[PDB]
Design a protein around this ligand. Sequence first.
Ligand SMILES: [Mn+2]
Length: 199
Amino acid sequence: MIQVEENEHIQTLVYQLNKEGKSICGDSFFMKADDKELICAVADGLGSGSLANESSAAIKDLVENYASEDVESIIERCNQAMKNKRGATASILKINFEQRQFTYCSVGNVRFILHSPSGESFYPLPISGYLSGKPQKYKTHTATYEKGSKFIIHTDGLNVPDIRSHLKKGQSVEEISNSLKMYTTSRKDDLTYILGQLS
Ligand SMILES: [Mn+2]
């Protein structure tokens, strides 16, 4: 499944495909942009299939509902919703277009890479563990991006040697998605990614 959106400030593409032979995806995403701001999130539920879905889907619902809050507030709501559930790894990104500012908070193995034209990348290491409902000491990143920046957020189902290169070479989110096609054919796990190109 592919979903594309565009406004004056960003173009985005969401890709998701289930693990081969699996009916119920354990990954979830949420994406909304208006003329002023973006929120997006990607999550991978612990366990698999349905119960994994309950955890990642709870994340998607809370990010939509609480989108106006700061990323760390949103992720803590997500953490509290994981008590008595499988848990999930998750990443939450907000962008203010006028300021060209992003804010990012994550726990687990959902990765975020933002490539700058100038050749700077923001590519944080994964935070160990997962959102379980037990206490967390979150790290929030706040930074300015430059016009032309391109990013991806992806679950562990996408395994790529050099993601930065795909972001650098692509001229659009469709092109970057197509550039990644070889990594999508095996379907060894659920695979979700969100691409963005920022004006
Ligand atoms: Mn996974």
